[PDB]
């Protein structure tokens, strides 16, 4: 009994975004599918349910608003795709969206999708720009002004892992992200060792490799 969700989505404010949930592995017709959403550092909020048998969502048109829940039956009935359409998006909508299965009539949710990030930002693709953090002492790299998430940071092409902290990216009023990656090492070994953070940003085939 399993639920797989679509990949991360990015969209400009005022547009529409679709999140998909593929269900398989049981009598799918027999269980409601709920959608939940989780804003950064926050608790879950109910978004709605849909009945797989009839396609009936919890709010009827007159109440649905900016969200519309749909299904399409993979006619064998071994598979079903469930959709969450969000129209006229805004920053508020930025969050992880989960589909989940209602087991009993009483809303115990025993299976969850892995979740889908929906990032609504004014901006669009940009590779990051990397500046060094120069000095047991500490050294690092500031990975600044990229979009969208994510980036991967390694040191000495993966040969250095100990003492490495790669922090969560924060967001700026710029509307773009900045994160920093750091290592600590004994006050010696400096002049001895070549410290090189390799940064990657898939979305933009950016792939700098900077030294400290």
């Amino acid at each position: 009994v399993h639920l797989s969700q679509s990949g991360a989505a990015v969209t400009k404010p005022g547009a529409s975004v679709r999140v998909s949930c593929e269900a398989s592995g049981y009598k799918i017709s027999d269980h409601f599918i709920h959608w939940w959403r989780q804003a950064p550092g926050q608790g879950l909020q109910w978004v709605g349910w849909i009945n797989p048998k009839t396609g009936q969502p919890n709010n009827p048109r007159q109440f649905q608003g900016r969200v519309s829940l749909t299904r399409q039956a993979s006619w064998d009935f071994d598979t079903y795709s469930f959709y969450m359409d969000l129209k006229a998006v805004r920053s508020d909508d930025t969050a992880i969206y989960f589909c989940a299965r209602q087991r009993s009539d009483f809303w115990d949710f025993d299976v969850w999708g892995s979740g889908t990030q929906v990032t609504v930002s004014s901006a669009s693709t940009k590779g990051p720009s990397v500046f060094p953090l120069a000095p047991t002492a500490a050294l690092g790299c500031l990975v600044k002004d990229y979009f969208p998430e994510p980036v991967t940071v390694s040191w000495n092409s993966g040969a250095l892992t100990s003492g490495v902290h790669t922090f969560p990216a924060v967001l700026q009023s710029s509307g773009l992200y900045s994160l920093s990656s750091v290592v600590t090492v004994p006050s010696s070994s400096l002049g001895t060792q070549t410290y090189i953070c390799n940064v990657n940003h898939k979305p933009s085939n950016t792939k700098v490799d900077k030294r400290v």
Partner: protein, 203 residues
């Protein structure tokens, strides 16, 4: 009308922790790992979900629902929450307790490569401290900056059970050069006295 207590728990491996909600109805408890989807631990007050260690259990008495974890393990580090129909409490962070540890503190002046871009970024690093509550203060020439700061913190470290925190003071090219002393002053439990690491032009 549903509440949960408390908002944060630290416990030692092998210890027992209890988390309470106030609520009404068919209630379920979930575990959620920092970065992941919830996992059902108990349904309907006290029924243990198939496949979950019996060191989890739940007690209803009136409007009080306890979730109890006995013999706490390293994989129990997560957020826990209760849920009744559409309503899900914000939940309790549980972390593993360890000996108190003051932050290794450092500062990082703007890179000149970057000043070439017009934006300057000063960085502060608090490294490997516990417990996780902390306060950074950005001071320059004893001026107290009160906007213009980001903060980011790591998850509890799966090895040494510490946290780390990075704080980025971003300010324009001009207003940077005009001042001299840049200090980072942080206050943490494990530190007898707020301590500062402070630079300026001497390099």
């Amino acid at each position: 009308q549903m509440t949960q207590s408390p908002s944060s728990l630290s416990a030692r491996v092998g210890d027992t922790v209890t988390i309470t909600c106030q609520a009404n109805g068919y209630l379920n408890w979930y575990q959620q790992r920092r970065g992941k989807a919830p996992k059902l631990l108990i349904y309907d007050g006290s029924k243990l979900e198939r496949g979950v260690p019996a060191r989890f259990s739940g007690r209803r008495w009136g409007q009080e629902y306890n979730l109890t974890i006995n013999n706490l393990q390293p994989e129990d580090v997560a957020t826990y929450f209760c849920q009744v129909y559409e309503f899900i409490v914000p939940g309790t962070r549980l972390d593993l307790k360890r000996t108190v540890a003051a932050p290794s503190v450092f500062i990082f002046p703007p890179s000149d490569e970057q000043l070439k871009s017009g934006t300057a970024s000063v960085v502060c690093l608090l490294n490997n401290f516990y417990p996780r509550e902390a306060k950074v203060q950005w001071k320059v020439d004893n001026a107290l900056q009160s906007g213009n700061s980001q903060e980011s913190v790591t998850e509890q470290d799966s090895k040494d059970s510490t946290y780390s925190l990075s704080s980025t003071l971003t300010l324009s090219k001009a207003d940077y050069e005009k001042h001299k002393v840049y200090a980072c002053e942080v206050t943490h439990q494990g530190l007898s006295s707020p301590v500062t690491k402070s630079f300026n032009r001497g390099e």
